[PDB]
Amino acid sequence: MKDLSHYGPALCVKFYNDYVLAGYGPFIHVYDYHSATLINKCRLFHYNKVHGLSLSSEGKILAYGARSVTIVELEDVLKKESLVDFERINSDWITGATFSFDNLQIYLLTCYNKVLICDLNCEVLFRKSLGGERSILYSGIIKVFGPDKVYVNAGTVMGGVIIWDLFSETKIHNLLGHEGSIFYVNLSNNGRYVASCSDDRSIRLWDLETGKQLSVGWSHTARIWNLMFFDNDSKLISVSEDCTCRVWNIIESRENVAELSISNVYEVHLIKSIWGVDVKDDEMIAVTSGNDGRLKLIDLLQLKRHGDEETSFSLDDIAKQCGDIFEKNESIKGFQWFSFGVIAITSLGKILKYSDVTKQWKLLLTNEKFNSYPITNGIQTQNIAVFSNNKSDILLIKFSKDSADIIETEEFHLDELSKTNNCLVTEYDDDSFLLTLQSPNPREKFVCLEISLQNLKIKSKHCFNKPENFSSSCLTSFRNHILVGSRFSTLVIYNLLDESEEPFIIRRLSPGDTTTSIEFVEDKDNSAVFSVTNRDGYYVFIELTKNRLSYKVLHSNKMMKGFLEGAFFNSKGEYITYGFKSSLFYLYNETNCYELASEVCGGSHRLWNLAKITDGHVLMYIKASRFHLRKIYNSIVPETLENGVHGREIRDISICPVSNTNTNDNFKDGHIFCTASEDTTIKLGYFNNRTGKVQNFWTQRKHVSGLQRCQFINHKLMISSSAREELFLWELNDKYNKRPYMTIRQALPVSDLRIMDFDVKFISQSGDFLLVTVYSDSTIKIWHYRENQNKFDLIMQGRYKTCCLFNVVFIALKEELLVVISPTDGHLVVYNITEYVPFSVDPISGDLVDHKLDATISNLPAPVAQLPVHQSGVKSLDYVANATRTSATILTGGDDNGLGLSNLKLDDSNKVTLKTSDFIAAAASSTITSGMLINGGKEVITTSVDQVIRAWEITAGKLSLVDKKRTTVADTGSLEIISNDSEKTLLIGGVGLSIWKK
Amino acid sequence: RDLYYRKAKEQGYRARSAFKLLQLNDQFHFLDDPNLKRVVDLCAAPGSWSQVLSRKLFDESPSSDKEDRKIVSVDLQPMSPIPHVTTLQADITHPKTLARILKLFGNEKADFVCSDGAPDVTGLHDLDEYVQQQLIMSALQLTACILKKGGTFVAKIFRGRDIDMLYSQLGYLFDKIVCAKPRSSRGTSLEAFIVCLGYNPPSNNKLCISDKLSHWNEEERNIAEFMACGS
Numbered sequence A: 001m002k003d004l005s006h007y008g009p010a011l012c013v014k015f016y017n018d019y020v021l022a023g024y025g026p027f028i029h030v031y032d033y034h035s036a037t038l039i040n041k042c043r044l045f046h047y048n049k050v051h052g053l054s055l056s057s058e059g060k061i062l063a064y065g066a067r068s069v070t071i072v073e074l075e076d077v078l079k080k081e082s083l084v085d086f087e088r089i090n091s092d093w094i095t096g097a098t099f100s101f102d103n104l105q106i107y108l109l110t111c112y113n114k115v116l117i118c119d120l121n122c123e124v125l126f127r128k129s130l131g132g133e134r135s136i137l138y139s140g141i142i143k144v145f146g147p148d149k150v151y152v153n154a155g156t157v158m159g160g161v162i163i164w165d166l167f168s169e170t171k172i173h174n175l176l177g178h179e180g181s182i183f184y185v186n187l188s189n190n191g192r193y194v195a196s197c198s199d200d201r202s203i204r205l206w207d208l209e210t211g212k213q214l215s216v217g218w219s220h221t222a223r224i225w226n227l228m229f230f231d232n233d234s235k236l237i238s239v240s241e242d243c244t245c246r247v248w249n250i251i252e253s254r255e256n257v258a259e260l261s262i263s264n265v266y267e268v269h270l271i272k273s274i275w276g277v278d279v280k281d282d283e284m285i286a287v288t289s290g291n292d293g294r295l296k297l298i299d300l301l302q303l304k305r306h307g308d309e310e311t312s313f314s315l316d317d318i319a320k321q322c323g324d325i326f327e328k329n330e331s332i333k334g335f336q337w338f339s340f341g342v343i344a345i346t347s348l349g350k351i352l353k354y355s356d357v358t359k360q361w362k363l364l365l366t367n368e369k370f371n372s373y374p375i376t377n378g379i380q381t382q383n384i385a386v387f388s389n390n391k392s393d394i395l396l397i398k399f400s401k402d403s404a405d406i407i408e409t410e411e412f413h414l415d416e417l418s419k420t421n422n423c424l425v426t427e428y429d430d431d432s433f434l435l436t437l438q439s440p441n442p443r444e445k446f447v448c449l450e451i452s453l454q455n456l457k458i459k460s461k462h463c464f465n466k467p468e469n470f471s472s473s474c475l476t477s478f479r480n481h482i483l484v485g486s487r488f489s490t491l492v493i494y495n496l497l498d499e500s501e502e503p504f505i506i507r508r509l510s511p512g513d514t515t516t517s518i519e520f521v522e523d524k525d526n527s528a529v530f531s532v533t534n535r536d537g538y539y540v541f542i543e544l545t546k547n548r549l550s551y552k553v554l555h556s557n558k559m560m561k562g563f564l565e566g567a568f569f570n571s572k573g574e575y576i577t578y579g580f581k582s583s584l585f586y587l588y589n590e591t592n593c594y595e596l597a598s599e600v601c602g603g604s605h606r607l608w609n610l611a612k613i614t615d616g617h618v619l620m621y622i623k624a625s626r627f628h629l630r631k632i633y634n635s636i637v638p639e640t641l642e643n644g645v646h647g648r649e650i651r652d653i654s655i656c657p658v659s660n661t662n663t664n665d666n667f668k669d670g671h672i673f674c675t676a677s678e679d680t681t682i683k684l685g686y687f688n689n690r691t692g693k694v695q696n697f698w699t700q701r702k703h704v705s706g707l708q709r710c711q712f713i714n715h716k717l718m719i720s721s722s723a724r725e726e727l728f729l730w731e732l733n734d735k736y737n738k739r740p741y742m743t744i745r746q747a748l749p750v751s752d753l754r755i756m757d758f759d760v761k762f763i764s765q766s767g768d769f770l771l772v773t774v775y776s777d778s779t780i781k782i783w784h785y786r787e788n789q790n791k792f793d794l795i796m797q798g799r800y801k802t803c804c805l806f807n808v809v810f811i812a813l814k815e816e817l818l819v820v821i822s823p824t825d826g827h828l829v830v831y832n833i834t835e836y837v838p839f840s841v842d843p844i845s846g847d848l849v850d851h852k853l854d855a856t857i858s859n860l861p862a863p864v865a866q867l868p869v870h871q872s873g874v875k876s877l878d879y880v881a882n883a884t885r886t887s888a889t890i891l892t893g894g895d896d897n898g899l900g901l902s903n904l905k906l907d908d909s910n911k912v913t914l915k916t917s918d919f920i921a922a923a924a925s926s927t928i929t930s931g932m933l934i935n936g937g938k939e940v941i942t943t944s945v946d947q948v949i950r951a952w953e954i955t956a957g958k959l960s961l962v963d964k965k966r967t968t969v970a971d972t973g974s975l976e977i978i979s980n981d982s983e984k985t986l987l988i989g990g991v992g993l994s995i996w997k998k
Numbered sequence B: 001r002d003l004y005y006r007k008a009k010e011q012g013y014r015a016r017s018a019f020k021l022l023q024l025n026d027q028f029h030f031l032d033d034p035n036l037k038r039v040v041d042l043c044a045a046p047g048s049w050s051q052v053l054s055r056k057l058f059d060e061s062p063s064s065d066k067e068d069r070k071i072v073s074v075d076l077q078p079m080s081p082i083p084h085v086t087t088l089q090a091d092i093t094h095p096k097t098l099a100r101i102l103k104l105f106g107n108e109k110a111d112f113v114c115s116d117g118a119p120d121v122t123g124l125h126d127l128d129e130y131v132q133q134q135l136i137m138s139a140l141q142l143t144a145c146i147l148k149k150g151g152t153f154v155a156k157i158f159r160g161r162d163i164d165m166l167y168s169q170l171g172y173l174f175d176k177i178v179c180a181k182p183r184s185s186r187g188t189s190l191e192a193f194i195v196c197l198g199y200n201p202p203s204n205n206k207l208c209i210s211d212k213l214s215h216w217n218e219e220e221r222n223i224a225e226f227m228a229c230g231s
């Protein structure tokens, strides 16, 4: 077998003259970080991950991890696939490694606080150690200040930081004060300071000269795994189990030596931990490496780099420039960003202009009509401001590009409207835009005006009847229709060519209320796709087809947290979202699940606006009687060097099966697949068949608890299950050009207890299917899923005993439908349900036929076969039937690290016999977690927690081990295999994901 | 959070882990022996295995087999007292901690030494497994002495990538090495227990058992026998 790609825990990262070197599983990855290009992947260790690495000035790399250490040439790492022959194994765990000052020796710190001085073949020359009783270390570093001044800085499990002089073997300090084990120690470059961190969640700054504690910093919310000084020892950066990277100021004064002060918090990795960090002082950039396999680049000067990121003005500042013109209780009530800066309007209808160039405010004009609750809208790209009020009045003003002179103005009143409570605008075409106005009277009209971009005159006015439960919240135009977002998750589509035509009404798209954005995505044939966001966090992608219109939901999901106020696609095709999490504005890359920026607004955040500008966005908002301008610049470097996968266990993996349907040509070089994680999400992505490179599309968040199973049951349907009887049927759409879409089709009825497993059998032509589920309480249920009424009907229920049931599988042999379970007692138990369900089995390829009878709940019959196989729980269950579907061979992997092969047969009289064919008692060193039959049952691939992938062959019902290979994926627990046309692709899941070829 | 956390509070056990030692003894039956007399619980905090030892050896035993029975439970952290248990706050490596344990028996070797100790996992599996092997090794050197020849030693293990090294590092010292999950052991944990039966012949800041078992063993892996435990 050959390993192709790996995404998983990346324990360390180093900046090196325009490279990032990342310890990435057992490899080093070398990136050109300005372009985010992966130059090479070089395997350094046979199986151990790289915990630490450092570079000599002359390009030698010292790397260590667990008991492995190696010295390797940067030039070889740049071009070779593997350098594992240079790996050496030390007898003890290696806590740290540094080059000697002249790079002629290396110093290895063991977990027992001994230093091994080695030559550059990693051979020991001598050892240094302290006197006294042993210390066990969870961290430590060797800090080389000069040729003969080497400090060993040891973080013990007991919570002391021992700092001692290497060559004299002399204790300098025993820094006490932490409450837990010490998980990282670092020293400032200028020799002034020690920093340590623990699982007490504190960072402690120590005086390296006096050994006194200077400052204790409490900010991180979980254990801290790494920290270091940067920016000439004026700042500290830390990285944590809480998935944040935190920057601290070292504030030096006379009266207190120095103190830590929190400066910035960056949430940068997926749940959970962050292991590695490094800073490039010149550019003030950081790099972090996560348990999720993400490598994140952080602009440490997001708020300062260009010098205009943050600005605020109170009404007094503004009055200092416009003059004392504001009345008692007058405040800014609307604002828009244009090329020149801001146009704002006050509660008394004063229209103000802020120039981004001169930084000056000035009064432009007053329109007393708009002292009656003015609303502000705009067409940013065309420098058009739109003012409305509650008295059916409208004011349009157009501004010159740089000058900001008023070059067009129009005003009008709409007699159709009594009171007006909502005004929306959207772009229409090269010459005009649309404006809608609504009133709360149910009998008044919904008014849409088409307005010239050139002189702001009305080209046409349309008046529509409002459907019953309709309050417009957002607006987009498409061809000759307007799509109007409404409350209650309603979307109303009107036809601008025929205001008497009945509107097309999409009700209840999501559980939420206000529709916040409608955005055109793509079109194909006679269908157009739209993104529709909802304030309460839900977003839906709908497909509008011209056949009269019809619609289908292609995608549905919920943001992790907070209000969702809009979403758009960037030039890379990534879904970008924005909204609020309580008082915090967010801009979030929802495709790859990382935050782009955030801002503390006014809690209630009643007045805010976001606008796109060249090289970023401007966020405008009112907070605490101040008008704030936050410029959100595109990062000076790429956001990530790897996007990453889950940062917790991957419990299941499913590849979308090949089909005769019209899967889009973009996916032709690879496969769409799902990972299901204990982090409670399902991630839908793609991998390239040749390179194993993985790309993310979506992170589905419906499940409330950790996933157990996900399986594509055919080319467009997928079932997942977790606990709380969460079982969801999903529908996938892969017909469009850039990404697949997935939406929930139905959830299983619920009776706490878990759905441990399921299996399905399709009902011939139907797209209906039978579903069996087994539960923690030993119950068994059989369901009929019917497409047209989109529901699950319970047709059978029963119980095995009381113990948990881990796996279940449908087996169709001859004209019988069999159910096979594997309880925790280690038995294989067979049920023949044929007589008790209104379905028939076709004798070959075993297809179900619907008898179209009414739904009765049968009781589960007594088992027809009970064979003991394993001495404990059965973790993996697979089967393959023979060519005549008269028998099946059943493969089981056990918690007893045994591998079982059993035979299920029907005789001429249809009597079921289950007999065991072979049992390998020591098939693995630990729990066997996956066991799949391939090549018509001739071969077996197994996975187990010992991180050894085993390939087997079956000859005459007997198993023999034919190949084995280690993976870095710890806690190896999921496996998926697909044939290419036989050569196979293996997806290997646990903590991390690896793709292999066989 | 689950079933056993609930029934631990119902039975007055300090932790759900109490059922792991009970579900263990539902076979091996090393605590159902009337002849069983002296036991040591290492890294016992907060003490639920010592409660189980107390209930089985005293509350649930005829007065006829309660004589010279002595339960010592050791942890560096201080423990709330348990009826019929001498709790020692000591380091399993320190001096008199074998001498003091020596004295609380009549210079008799223990029938049975158990340890359910484990640090909180970090999520870094290679570190978590290595640290767990450390605890077992250091626990093993007290068990090397105080254990009666032919007496069982029970310890919690991290049943991961390098467990097979521990099994054969442990071959030199036991008649039958067994490995068991109970059923109160969470499916989401890499947990298992190494139930070492029939203590066989041992040997005859400095050198420790971890480096001298690393000395002889070295880089070899064997697979111990497996045994489910509960009913």
Ligand SMILES: C[S@@+](CC[C@H](N)C(=O)[O-])C[C@H]1O[C@@H](n2cnc3c(N)ncnc32)[C@H](O)[C@@H]1O
Residues within 6 Å of the ligand: B014, B015, B017, B018, B042, B043, B044, B045, B046, B047, B048, B049, B074, B075, B076, B077, B090, B091, B092, B093, B115, B116, B117, B118, B119
């Ligand atoms: C998982 S807890 C043990 C659980 C306990 N046996 C029970 O069932 O209630 C781990 C314990 O190991 C202890 N420990 C770690 N190192 C030790 C040492 N060197 N000497 C004594 N105890 C130690 C810790 O104090 C901690 O109480």
